[PDB]
Each structure stands twice: as structure tokens, then as C-alpha cells.
Scaffold this active site. Sequence first.
Site, short mmCIF file in Angstrom:
data_model
loop_
_atom_site.label_atom_id
_atom_site.label_comp_id
_atom_site.label_asym_id
_atom_site.label_seq_id
_atom_site.Cartn_x
_atom_site.Cartn_y
_atom_site.Cartn_z
N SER A 44 0.85 -1.18 0.00
CA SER A 44 0.00 0.00 0.00
C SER A 44 0.89 1.24 0.00
O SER A 44 1.85 1.31 0.76
CB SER A 44 -0.94 -0.04 1.21
OG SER A 44 -1.76 1.11 1.26
N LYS A 83 -0.17 -6.20 5.61
CA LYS A 83 0.01 -4.97 4.86
C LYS A 83 1.46 -4.52 5.01
O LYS A 83 1.99 -4.45 6.10
CB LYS A 83 -0.97 -3.95 5.44
CG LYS A 83 -0.80 -2.50 5.04
CD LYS A 83 -1.33 -1.57 6.13
CE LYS A 83 -1.63 -0.16 5.66
NZ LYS A 83 -2.25 0.67 6.73
N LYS A 130 -17.34 13.70 -8.01
CA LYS A 130 -16.39 14.76 -8.25
C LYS A 130 -16.57 15.29 -9.68
O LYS A 130 -17.49 16.06 -9.94
CB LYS A 130 -15.00 14.25 -7.87
CG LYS A 130 -14.87 13.98 -6.38
CD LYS A 130 -13.46 13.84 -5.87
CE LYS A 130 -13.39 14.07 -4.37
NZ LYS A 130 -13.68 12.82 -3.66
C1 LIG Z 1 -8.79 9.36 -3.22
C2 LIG Z 1 -10.22 9.12 -2.83
N1 LIG Z 1 -10.68 7.87 -2.84
C3 LIG Z 1 -11.97 7.63 -2.51
C4 LIG Z 1 -12.85 8.61 -2.15
C5 LIG Z 1 -14.28 8.28 -1.80
O1 LIG Z 1 -15.18 8.88 -2.80
P1 LIG Z 1 -16.73 9.24 -2.44
O2 LIG Z 1 -16.73 10.69 -1.97
O3 LIG Z 1 -17.56 8.94 -3.70
O4 LIG Z 1 -17.10 8.29 -1.31
C6 LIG Z 1 -12.41 9.94 -2.13
C7 LIG Z 1 -13.31 11.03 -1.75
O5 LIG Z 1 -12.99 12.11 -1.28
C8 LIG Z 1 -11.07 10.20 -2.49
O6 LIG Z 1 -10.65 11.51 -2.47
#
Ligand SMILES: Cc1ncc(COP(=O)(O)O)c(C=O)c1O
Lengths: 456, 417
Positions: A126, A145, A259
Site C-alpha cells: 500500500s 500490509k 467529483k
Molecule cells: C482518493 C479518494 N478515494 C476515494 C474517495 C471516496 O469517494 P466518495 O466521496 O464517492 O465516497 C475519495 C473522496 O474524497 C477520495 O478523495
Amino acid sequence: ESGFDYEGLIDSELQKKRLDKSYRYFNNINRLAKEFPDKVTVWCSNDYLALSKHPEVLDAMHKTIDKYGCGAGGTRNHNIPTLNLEAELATLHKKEGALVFSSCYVANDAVLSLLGQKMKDLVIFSDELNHASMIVGIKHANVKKHIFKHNDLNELEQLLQSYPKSVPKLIAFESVYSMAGSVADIEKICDLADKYGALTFLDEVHAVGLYGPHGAGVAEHCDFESHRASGIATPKTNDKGGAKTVMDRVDMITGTLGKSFGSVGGYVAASRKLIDWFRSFAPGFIFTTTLPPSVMAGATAAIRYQRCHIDLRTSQQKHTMYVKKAFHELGIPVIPNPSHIVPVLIGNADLAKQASDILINKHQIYVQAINFPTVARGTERLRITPTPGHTNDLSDILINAVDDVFNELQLPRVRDWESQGGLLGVGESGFVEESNLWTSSQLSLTNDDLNPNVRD
Amino acid sequence: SGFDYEGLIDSELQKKRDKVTVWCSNDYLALSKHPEVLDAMHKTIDKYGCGAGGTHNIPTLNLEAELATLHKKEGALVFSSCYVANDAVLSLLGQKMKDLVIFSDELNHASMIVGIKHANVKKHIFKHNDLNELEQLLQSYPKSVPKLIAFESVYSMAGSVADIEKICDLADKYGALTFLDEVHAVGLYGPHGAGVAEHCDFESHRASGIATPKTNDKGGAKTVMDRVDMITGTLGKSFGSVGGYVAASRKLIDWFRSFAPGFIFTTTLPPSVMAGATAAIRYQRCHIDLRTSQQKHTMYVKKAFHELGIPVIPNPSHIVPVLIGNADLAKQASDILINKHQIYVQAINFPTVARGTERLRITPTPGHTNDLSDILINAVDDVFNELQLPRVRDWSNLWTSSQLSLTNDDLNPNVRD
Ligand SMILES: Cc1ncc(COP(=O)(O)O)c(C=O)c1O
Ligand SMILES: *Cc1c(COP(=O)(O)O)cnc(C)c1O
């Protein structure tokens, strides 16, 4: 002995938080309730393509409501809006299938959790700066991990090579990291995955809409010309003549609808077999209400539109590059990055918060101050995300305002950072900035340079 | 050479391998299609657009205020879903109280089971609604050990109902918090649809409207709904939208808001979806006719089934589970209902319920008038005879007739404030 002091625990936890008071007793209800509550240019937003307010999206919403109503509960015919949205997402990423969840948080958690529940001996590798939703997914997996230093693929390879090839593995990373705009070398990670027998899990939340000819993300961008030529079709070869593109090689791609795509929700795109498995076994999918048809239709419209409007991306990238070039000449310290994000380094939480406080009150500009724990203490910054809507005249108001705030609060400039040795690339003696993902060639493309099949 | 990912998936997968009257639905009050709800949606889109990214917002404050009002709590917090609400709240309670012991009803929803697992604390399962077993478990700990009792008001597959007041009694005695999921009750119980907790003090709540009453139905100081520490629900079923929530004291709500990652690290729900839910909650609060009509339709279907000896699992709620006791026959029954009678009913099998207890799930609504019910009764009776299914011989309601005779003008005028 009496009971546990629940209230005492909560009060002491809360006393550490900065929460001023909005609840008061109301005679009419005989209990406490929350007491109820301008022309500002938003320069920090996750609505990267401004599609949440685009007519095609609002039209798709209004029309879907007329047909279907509000919630999914009121429909019996998966439903058609779900199939439409899944098909669009599968098409975007050129995957066999896709699955939609409440949010990308839930998508990340549900997938990572299931991989670890079904493969107890899985080892997850990760990136240290992965989003909290990925961290929680990996935790919920309850498997081993190893964290590798951010984008340090030397360290990743050392960790991978220390295991036998036959040990199941997953490499979990993002394409774009939102707080500094750094970008993973997806193709190299795919190479490592092949060599050491790992699955790849890629979060393209901050890239979908923004990279590749069709907005399919950084993975698409790695084979920009193959994807541009083929449109929605699977290209016959990749950019260097081989059989499989990077985006084809990634096992699992997650994104948001919340987004760029101007709606709400998350998804994973993957092989039919992976999608069927998630759908069959993941409780965070199975045991929750389907998103409203109207929200899914809106996302669908946003995806379809953005796919065939490369001018959205070229526009965003030109605005970003306009802001960055201006900041460079004024010595305003942007953390160097090849993406659409403009992080202005402050290095002080109080001054970062005070800067966006003056931007909002005195310049009617909204910019987000970012502090610990989001970023490291000492690396506090203002986050700026130019959009297609930020024309050069608006950018000029942003540049003057920020320059004025730097002078008012006497903040460090690029040459000040230098005299301290640099930080995160800013004023670093002999730093080799990554090239922008979008080349001059790519930026001169128009909608006419897309394959006609991107509209059908 | 490398691990056979595909082989594992294939093995897992192989191990599992028109104008119809809907008689099974989570849209209990048909509010997903109600004009006030659709109007609130269309208007909100015109103001705000689609996603929250382009815009706390006012729609969030309005929705939270309505939910706090519904449950007569100080505050409320909206999440993506009730799944996420349950997971986030249970997880946080376990993370912040290291010696927490959770006592969980065996038939709690998957979301609660996952929340409890994520809490990663000591866990005891009690037999469904067995408060003798719950008490024995609670009394085996010292009072000073922090505890949580996690349960639902209504259980969706058989329509059984928790004795919320007695659980609150046990919570008092053994020093436990109570965590109540009212997903299958909100909209449907109490004068204002606030759920079974409200229904336990029906008259006190009816009298006081949106106000907190100073006495309960038996003369005491605090109502049941007031005594429950945390109440969760969905916006996705009765309330005709999507989302979830918890309603609780200001201090609990501020704590959840300050510390829960599944709140902080997700995109806010679309303003339009929130506005719709808000309109649905406002409407249903002042339309007790929704509930009285649902309950009358249910009782009409049940009484008919009773006299025909069609085996309904007895329950005091709005659910009509017709016991079949065979997965193939249960699936075949709803197959004939749909094809021959254009009636949709859901066959429920393992693992949703125990093998042997397979059933058809029927959920009468305000929209199911007696003429439609008559078509359902004849059709089901016909299918029982066609498939030669077992009848009763082969193998009281929360809503009183007093409560059922109330109309909208029996509510406090303050319910339209
Ligand atoms: C890098 C990243 N992964 C996952 C998510 C989760 O997305 P959602 O807002 O649709 O739950 C976000 C949201 O801010 C994010 O910035
Ligand atoms: C349906 C269900 C939920 C899940 O709520 P969503 O908002 O659909 O995620 C939670 N609790 C129970 C008891 C349910 O039946």
C-alpha cells in the site's frame, strides 16, 4: 458501584475539539435543537468539470424523476438506470463490467475487505499516502500490509521480491494524490505486478474526467494515442506496439461519481468474474438501497458528455498551467506536480487558515486551507483546483489576490524556501520536476480529433 | 507459477451457481412518487444542481433538523446510507470504549453485524427477542463495564417487534447504552411515524405533537423514545429517497461528527435527494391516515388469510409473511403470482431465513385498497391450491382500534410548524 461515565468520556473527547455551540433549549418543543443560520468565486472544489450544474445533467435528472420518482424503492424495473450507469462506466474504463456503490469510500472498503476475507494469506502493498477509505478497506481486510514510501517503486519492488511469486498479493495505490497532485507510475506498477504475481487495485477518483482522451483517467493516458484512435473500442495494440494497454492490465479500478461526474456514488470496474464476485458476496453492496434513478441518470449524462468533450480537459489543463506559470514568475511556492492541482505551500497552520480567511473576506475567493492531520505538520498549504470555468480573467483576479495575501501576511516565497534547502520540491537545489501528463500535442487536440464512436 | 486468482474466483462463483400490482416493496407509503417529494426535488435541482460538489449546506441542516424533530432528539447526523450509519456508529463506540461489551439480537441486519465486527470488542449474541437470555448475559458483567444493546424495532422477514421499553429497563439496571435500528418502523408506527419507540408512548406523543411531553403514557417522567440513546434509520424505504441517519443527544451527534471517518471521508448526498427526503418526512408526520390505512389493509389481508387457513407468520406489525417451507415451492409460487395473476411478491429463502422457513413476503401499503386485496387473496388461495402447499392445520397488533380511528385533525397543529 455505578455505571460507566459515558457522558464524562464524550465531554473530555469533545473538549479537545474546537466545537462552538449551535444547540439551545426551545420552549415550544421542550428540548434542545440546532439553531438555524455570498458572491464568491470558488477556486477549490471537487466538481472539477463543473458538470453538477451542466444542463445535460440537470435535464437527465428532471426527466428521470418524471419517469421514476425519487428513490429506487419506488421502482421494480437491477433497474434500467443502474444498467445504463454500469454500462457507461464499463465503457469508460474498457472493462467487461462495473458495479456501483453508495460512495467510492464504500467501493474501496467493500472490495479490499472482500479480497482479504476470501484470501486470508493475501499480502497488501500500500502506498503510504493512500486515501483513508483505502486504509480502512485494508484494515477491514485483516491481512498483512506493507506500506511503501510514496511512489517509491524501488521500495515496492524490494518488498514484493522478498515473497515467493505464489503468495497472493495486491498493490493498492491511487493514480492522482489530491493534496500535492503527485501521480503514480501505473505502467511500472503493472510491470511489477506481472513479475511478482500481484493483483492491482487502482483508485482513479482524482483522475476520472481529467486524464486520457475520454477522461477515463491516468491509466487511459498511459496509452493516450491507442485509446484516442480506438474511441470506445478496445485498441488492437498499445502505444508501444504490445497487446495490452495499461488500463486493460489493471485488475480493479475504482472511482467516484461525486467529483468530476457531478453526482454521488462510487464504483469498481473490472473483469466480469471479479464484478460478479463482488456483487455476489460484498455486504456493503448487497445490503444497501440502490441510489435514486435520477442521481444515476445524472452521472450517466455527465460521463457521456465528458467522454466526447476533450475540450473540458484541455481547458482545465490550460487554466492550471496559466495559474502555475503566473505563480512561478511571482515566486509563489506551488508544490511541483504534473497534474491539475495547484498546492500553494505555506508551512504554517495558523497562517494557512488566515490566508484563506483573507481570500474569502477581502477578495471573495474560496480556497481550502489544508493542515495536520490531512498533511504533515510543517507542510500546510492552500489547495487550488482550476476548472474549465476558470477563464484567464478569473485567474488574473486569483493571482493578484494570492500575491496580495502573500505580501499582507508576509508569507515565505520560493526563494525563502530555497534558503532553508527546499520542501516537497519547492526551491530544491537541482530537483527534476516530472513533465505534465498533458503534452503540448495532447493539449492542441479538439473534439473533432476523437473517434466518432464516442457519441455512439 | 503465480497465485491462481481466477481459479479461486471461479470456484467461489460455482459454489453459488408490465402493469403488475406490486405487493412487496420497501416504499411502504409510496412517498418516492409523491408530488410534494418530486416537487421538492425539481425545485432543489433548479437551485443547486445535481451533486453536492457544485454547492454544512442548507439542505443538510433542514434534513437533520427534520430527523431530530421526528425522533424528538437534540440532533441528527445524515450518512450515505443506514448501512454506513450503523457501521460508523457501532465502530466508533467500540474504538472509543476499549472495554465495551456489545449485546446483539441474533436477527439484526447485516449492517449491524458488520458494525459490531468493526467495533472489534467483546460481543454476545442473544436469541431473537429473548430478554431472559439478554438479562443473564448483562448480569454476568459488573455494572461499571460499558455496554451496548443493539437491536431493531421491527424485523423485516417475520415482522416481529422488540420490547423496547423492557430493553431500556435492562439498560438502566445494567448500565448499558441502547442502539435502536427503526428502519422497518419509521413512517409506520407512532402518531407521527417516528417508529415503535414513539408508539410505546402513543398518546403522550400525539398530544404533544413535535414537542417533548413532560410525562409518558404510564405517568412517568421520560418516554421510551427519549430513553433510547441512539436511533438509526434509512431515508431509502418509507421516506422514498436514499441515505441514513442517527438521532441522539447533541453530545453523541457532535462526537460522531468529529470522529467518524465514514462520515468525514465521503461526498455529501445530492441536495435534491435530501430535499426529497425532507418533504417526505414532513408530509408523513402530519398524515396519520397513511399509517391507519396501511394497518387496515394489512389487517384485512391477514384476517382473510386466517379464515382461508393461509399460514401467515403471526406478528403485530405491517408485514404478511406467508410460510411455504420449501425454497423451490416458494420461488414457484411467486412465479405463478407474477405470470398468471400479474402480482409481484418476493420469495425469501436461505440464507435470508432458515432453511425450512422459506416464505412469501407481502407488504400492504396505503395504496392497496380492499378491491386490490381481494385480487391478492384469490390469487394466493389459487396458488396454494395449484401447488398444494401446506395450510395452518398442516403446520396482538401494535395499532389498537382506538389508534386506528384517529384522523389527521387528531394531531397537534404544531406538526405543521
Ligand atoms: C482518493 C479518494 N478515494 C476515494 C474517495 C471516496 O469517494 P466518495 O466521496 O464517492 O465516497 C475519495 C473522496 O474524497 C477520495 O478523495
Ligand atoms: C434495509 C436495511 C438497512 C440498510 O439501510 P440503507 O439505507 O438501505 O443502507 C438497515 N437496517 C435494516 C434493518 C434494513 O432492513
